């Protein structure tokens, strides 16, 4: 009549409202061999708002278009969960990806399904990055707070009466400290100057907690020039080049603080869209139940595999 069942060639069926020869209203539709199940609203052959269940028990709950996850929705997989916006099947623009295991998390913008633009990244150990992203990596300006020796033995401190975190603000290239940047440990140990692939490389100043200033040129983290002296050229004084790089590094740090603040603002937007995505998953589940009940009322022996999936 205006609803029922249809068996596909590759296996898997459709069972629900139809009108004008196309699925319309509500219904279920399994995949080849009856594996994988959509269940929700339809409109002229295309899912509108519904829940897809993989045989693995993984699910997308949200809105659809042209057969792609589009709009808001929640994807629950084994170890990862995404809540927020989807654009033609790709995560983004705004949304959050969270670990089922750890507190590991990304909250920000996405381009082409990868972390990109501005976002807050939290690592399993509780550290964070806030700032710019490109192609799924820390890139541009940003602020990372994390846990950071040659003598392992405590002798040097066990001898006399005796009474952490590190923050890098500066340039990032493909997930690495690279360019100008400032690095500050909670002890007071600090480096301002040039970086390459997370190492001091170029000119900069290492200042010890007591304030002793080591100024010079670093090459893959090893000092190779200092400010003592001899055949130093007037045209190329280490103190000048260090000063320039230090200034370059504080500029980069302040820039990275700004991009950090933008990232924080984009993070709130991603959170807002993640909550909006919970209401989209609630609506998707309302449509799914309408389709589950109509399906039992149009074919009481037709097996719905999604329930069994999600138990496993």
From Swiss-Prot:
MORN repeat coordinates: 14-36, 38-59, 60-79, 82-104, 106-128, 129-148, 168-190, 191-213
Impact upon substituting residue 141 to H: In CMH17; results in vacuolization of intracellular structures and cardiomyocyte hypertrophy; affects intracellular calcium handling and homeostasis
Keyword Nucleus included in the entry's annotation: yes
GO molecular function: DNA binding; DNA-binding transcription repressor activity, RNA polymerase II-specific; phosphatidic acid binding; phosphatidylinositol-3,4,5-trisphosphate binding; phosphatidylinositol-3,5-bisphosphate binding; phosphatidylinositol-3-phosphate binding; phosphatidylinositol-4,5-bisphosphate binding; phosphatidylinositol-4-phosphate binding
Tissue-specific expression: Specifically expressed in skeletal muscle and heart.
Source species, domain of life: Eukaryota
Keywords for this protein: Cardiomyopathy, Cell membrane, Developmental protein, Disease variant, DNA-binding, Endoplasmic reticulum, Membrane, Nucleus, Phosphoprotein, Repeat, Repressor, Sarcoplasmic reticulum, Transcription, Transcription regulation, Transmembrane, Transmembrane helix
GO biological process terms, semicolon-separated: calcium ion homeostasis; calcium ion transport into cytosol; positive regulation of ryanodine-sensitive calcium-release channel activity; regulation of cardiac muscle contraction by calcium ion signaling; regulation of cardiac muscle tissue development; regulation of release of sequestered calcium ion into cytosol by sarcoplasmic reticulum
Chain positions of site Cleavage: 151-152
Consequence of substituting residue 281 to S: In CMH17; uncertain significance
Position of sequence motif Bipartite nuclear localization signal: 228-241
Signal peptide: none
GO cellular component: endoplasmic reticulum membrane; junctional membrane complex; junctional sarcoplasmic reticulum membrane; nucleus; plasma membrane; sarcoplasmic reticulum; Z disc
Modified how: Proteolytically cleaved by calpain in response to cardiac stress. The major cleavage site takes place at the C-terminus and leads to the release of the Junctophilin-2 N-terminal fragment chain (JP2NT).
Disorder: Cardiomyopathy, familial hypertrophic, 17: A hereditary heart disorder characterized by ventricular hypertrophy, which is usually asymmetric and often involves the interventricular septum. The symptoms include dyspnea, syncope, collapse, palpitations, and chest pain. They can be readily provoked by exercise. The disorder has inter- and intrafamilial variability ranging from benign to malignant forms with high risk of cardiac failure and sudden cardiac death. Cardiomyopathy, dilated, 2E: A form of dilated cardiomyopathy, a disorder characterized by ventricular dilation and impaired systolic function, resulting in congestive heart failure and arrhythmia. Patients are at risk of premature death. CMD2E is an autosomal recessive form with neonatal or early childhood onset and rapid progression to cardiac failure.
Free-text comment on this protein's domains from its UniProt entry: The MORN (membrane occupation and recognition nexus) repeats contribute to the plasma membrane binding, by interacting with phospholipids. Has affinity for phosphatidylserine, and phosphorylated phosphatidylinositols including PtdIns3P, PtdIns4P, PtdIns5P, PtdIns(3,5)P2 and PtdIns(3,4,5)P3.
Description of how the protein assembles with itself and partners: Interacts with TRPC3. Interacts with BAG5 and HSPA8; the interaction with HSPA8 is increased in the presence of BAG5.
Assigned protein family: Belongs to the junctophilin family.
Protein's name in the database: Junctophilin-2
Lineage summary: Eukaryota, Metazoa, Chordata, Craniata, Vertebrata
